[PDB]
Amino acid sequence: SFVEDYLTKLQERPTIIENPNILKGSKIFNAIYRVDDFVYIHIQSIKSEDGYNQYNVIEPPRPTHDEMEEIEEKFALSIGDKEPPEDTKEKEKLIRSILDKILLRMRLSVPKEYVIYHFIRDKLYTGSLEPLIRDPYIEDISIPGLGHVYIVHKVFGPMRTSIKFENYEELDNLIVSLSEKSYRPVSHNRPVVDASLPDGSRVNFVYGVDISRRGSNLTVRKFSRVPTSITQLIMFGTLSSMMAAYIWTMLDEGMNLFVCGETASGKTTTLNAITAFIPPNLKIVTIEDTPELTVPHSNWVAEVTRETGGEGTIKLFDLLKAALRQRPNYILVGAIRDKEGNVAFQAMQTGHSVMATFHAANITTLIQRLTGYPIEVPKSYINNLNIALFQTALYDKKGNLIRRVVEVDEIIDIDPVTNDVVYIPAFTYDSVQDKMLFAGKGSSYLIENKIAVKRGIDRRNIGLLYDELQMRSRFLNLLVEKKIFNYYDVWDYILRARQMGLEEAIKYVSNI
Amino acid sequence: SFVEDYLTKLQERPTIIENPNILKGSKIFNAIYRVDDFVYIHIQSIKSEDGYNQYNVIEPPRPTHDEMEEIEEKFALSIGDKEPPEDTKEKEKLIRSILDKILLRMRLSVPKEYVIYHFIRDKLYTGSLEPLIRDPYIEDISIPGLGHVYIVHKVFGPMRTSIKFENYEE
Numbered sequence: 134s135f136v137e138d139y140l141t142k143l144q145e146r147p148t149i150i151e152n153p154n155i156l157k158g159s160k161i162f163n164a165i166y167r168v169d170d171f172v173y174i175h176i177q178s179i180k181s182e183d184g185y186n187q188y189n190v191i192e193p194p195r196p197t198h199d200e201m202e203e204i205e206e207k208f209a210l211s212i213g214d215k216e217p218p219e220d221t222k223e224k225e226k227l228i229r230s231i232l233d234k235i236l237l238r239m240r241l242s243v244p245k246e247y248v249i250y251h252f253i254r255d256k257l258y259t260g261s262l263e264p265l266i267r268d269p270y271i272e273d274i275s276i277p278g279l280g281h282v283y284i285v286h287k288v289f290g291p292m293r294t295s296i297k298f299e300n301y302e303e304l305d306n307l308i309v310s311l312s313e314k315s316y317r318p319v320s321h322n323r324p325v326v327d328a329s330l331p332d333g334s335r336v337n338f339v340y341g342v343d344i345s346r347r348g349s350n351l352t353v354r355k356f357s358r359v360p361t362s363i364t365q366l367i368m369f370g371t372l373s374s375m376m377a378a379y380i381w382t383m384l385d386e387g388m389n390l391f392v393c394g395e396t397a398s399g400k401t402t403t404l405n406a407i408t409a410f411i412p413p414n415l416k417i418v419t420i421e422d423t424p425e426l427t428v429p430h431s432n433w434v435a436e437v438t439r440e441t442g443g444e445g446t447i448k449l450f451d452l453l454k455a456a457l458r459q460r461p462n463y464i465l466v467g468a469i470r471d472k473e474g475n476v477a478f479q480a481m482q483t484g485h486s487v488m489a490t491f492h493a494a495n496i497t498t499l500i501q502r503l504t505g506y507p508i509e510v511p512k513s514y515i516n517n518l519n520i521a522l523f524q525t526a527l528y529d530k531k532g533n534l535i536r537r538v539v540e541v542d543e544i545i546d547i548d549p550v551t552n553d554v555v556y557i558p559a560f561t562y563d564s565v566q567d568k569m570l571f572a573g574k575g576s577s578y579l580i581e582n583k584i585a586v587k588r589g590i591d592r593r594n595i596g597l598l599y600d601e602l603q604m605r606s607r608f609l610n611l612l613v614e615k616k617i618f619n620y621y622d623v624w625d626y627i628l629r630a631r632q633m634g635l636e637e638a639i640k641y642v643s644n645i
Numbered sequence: 646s647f648v649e650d651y652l653t654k655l656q657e658r659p660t661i662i663e664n665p666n667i668l669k670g671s672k673i674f675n676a677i678y679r680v681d682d683f684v685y686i687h688i689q690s691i692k693s694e695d696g697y698n699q700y701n702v703i704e705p706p707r708p709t710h711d712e713m714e715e716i717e718e719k720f721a722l723s724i725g726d727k728e729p730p731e732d733t734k735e736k737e738k739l740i741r742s743i744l745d746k747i748l749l750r751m752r753l754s755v756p757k758e759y760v761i762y763h764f765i766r767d768k769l770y771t772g773s774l775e776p777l778i779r780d781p782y783i784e785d786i787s788i789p790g791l792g793h794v795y796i797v798h799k800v801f802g803p804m805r806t807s808i809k810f811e812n813y814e815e
């Protein structure tokens with residue numbers, strides 16, 4: 134076996150372990166754990182001089198270079214005109230079959246199963262990075278330029294791996310090839326690309342020695358295909374159950390809402406979580422530069438922009454215009470920054486609800502940016518946007534990083550004397566006690582001028598609305614208590630609440 | 646009676662109603678109305694958690710792939726790299742004439758009227774979508790991606806149809 138082989142070259146043998154969690158804290162060890170049937174990891178407790186532990190990937194041996202060239206060329210010669218299917222499984226099925234035909238009649242330097250591993254690894258997956266992708270104990274992967282691949286391991290922290298890139302052009306080719314597999318090719322014109330690998334891991338590419346002077350570089354950040362849910366956000370303290378119940382009520386009624394803040398404040402995460410509040414039987418069109426939103430609704434159009442360096446380039450603006458003809462109930466724009474913002478408000482003015490993330494720390498800044506170049510939403514249409522929430526990163530007393538929705542504003546008007554926004558802060562934040570404050574009872578213009586009127590409830594039975602709100606807050610609190618945190622489970626519980634009512638829903642989930 | 650054929654696989658018995666207006670707005674229902682001679686619609690409420698009720702298309706049975714393929718081949722032959730005229734109604738007329746000419750002495754697994762329906766439906770109209778286009782109670786039709794065709798119905802609101810697209814290429 135390829136593994137046992139490797140061991141025999143060693144000065145002294147490492148102990149086989151199920152996983153590195155046992156090695157935690159320790160520092161006198163020597164171990165090999167299994168990842169795939171094709172990937173074993175050898176971890177060495179002896180630091181390098183620069184304090185890196187060594188992460189050694191054990192893979193089966195590769196065929197010769199000339200063998201590989203012969204195979205690729207034959208593979209290319211077969212089928213070479215036909216395009217492969219889009220479906221990843223059907224694609225791999227086809228490739229393995231074709232490969233099996235070519236190899237059958239060949240005399241290989243290494244076993245067939247090994248040629249197959251490496252061919253598939255390089256052609257369909259992430260090549261020499263694939264073992265790192267497959268190890269669940271890897272958090273982050275970095276190729277900073279020529280040299281080793283560095284990782285952050287959940288047990289050992291930063292480690293130097295046995296994988297090396299010693300050639301500029303080979304490194305360029307890796308970045309080009311991986312970005313193409315991530316559906317968003319780099320180019321010299323647009324050498325910086327954020328995207329996701331097929332497994333869902335986030336990847337950042339920086340292409341070309343003219344920008345990344347030690348060679349093209351990349352960073353992979355692993356993390357769930359399952360998006361963070363609204364119950365997790367409540368448990369984190371990012372928003373209260375009442376705040377979530379409020380948003381839930383508003384999305385039930387088609388309100389337009391922007392999630393605002395600075396970069397990495399968590400805006401996209403919050404937008405994705407609250408999307409689960411959009412009623413299930415509605416049409417959702419998402420428009421993004423790269424996919425991040427994981428919408429659970431069935432009627433979901435997911436559109437992504439494209440840069441070609443010429444004809445065929447499609448921007449958020451173009452997609453948003455097309456959405457006016459796609460009968461969506463909600464349009465979710467990944468981020469609004471340029472003239473697509475103007476079209477977002479056109480969408481609102483034509484009866485489509487909209488959510489987006491936006492870069493602004495407060496309502497004053499949000500309105501200045503919406504109404505100014507290059508967005509130029511006219512002032513009298515600004516109140517089509519109903520709600521702006523503002524989210525920020527902070528440190529607590531201990532120094533731990535936290536993210537908090539620090540204000541939720543209802544947009545009422547722009548005052549003609551003179552050009553200041555009229556708004557109501559429905560929620561605010563006390564940074565000292567780390568608590569969310571509600572305005573609250575009989576403070577919301579949206580509850581008591583839009584929803585109450587639709588309902589159509591009188592100003593003296595308005596308690597009925599605030600009671601439904603307090604109700605939704607209890608149900609959410611209950612989900613948190615019972616540790617219903619998974620995105621799709623939370624979605625199911627929300628749909629369940631739609632389909633038997635709150636009163637019946639709270640009382641159910643109280644049992645477990 | 647391709648409708649009766651469809652009906653009999655059904656455990657429950659859809660009421661025939663000829664007009665779905667009389668169901669607005671009932672949360673329980675299992676009925677059938679006619680759209681035209683070749684299209685009946687079976688609508689049904691279920692306990693779906695995402696709030697989509699069922700809109701099932703009832704069309705005549707298709708001829709086999711081999712039957713259809715033979716027909717398309719002969720049709721191509723009968724044209725002989727001649728471009729259609731430029732009118733459109735005179736087109737369908739010419740196409741239906743050629744069809745009769747070709748099906749005249751063929752033996753098909755399904756009635757010849759059904760062969761013509763499907764053939765004309767895929768060649769001239771919108772294929773599997775055509776019943777939805779023909780149904781006057783449908784406002785929106787969406788194929789958002791792989792999965793079901795979704796519609797918005799004047800009586801029932803958004804519904805999930807029985808029509809499915811599960812292959813990227815097609």
Ligand SMILES: Nc1ncnc2c1ncn2[C@@H]1O[C@H](COP(=O)(O)OP(=O)(O)O)[C@@H](O)[C@H]1O
Binds near residue numbers: 396
């Ligand atoms: N409420 C939260 N609590 C903790 N971490 C969060 C929260 N929201 C987002 N994150 C994490 O913070 C980082 C930035 O999140 P993201 O939603 O992309 O922010 P933005 O969209 O503002 O750039 C990501 O790693 C994400 O997993």
Ligand SMILES: [Mg+2]
Binds near residue numbers: 400401402490
């Ligand atoms: Mg974001």
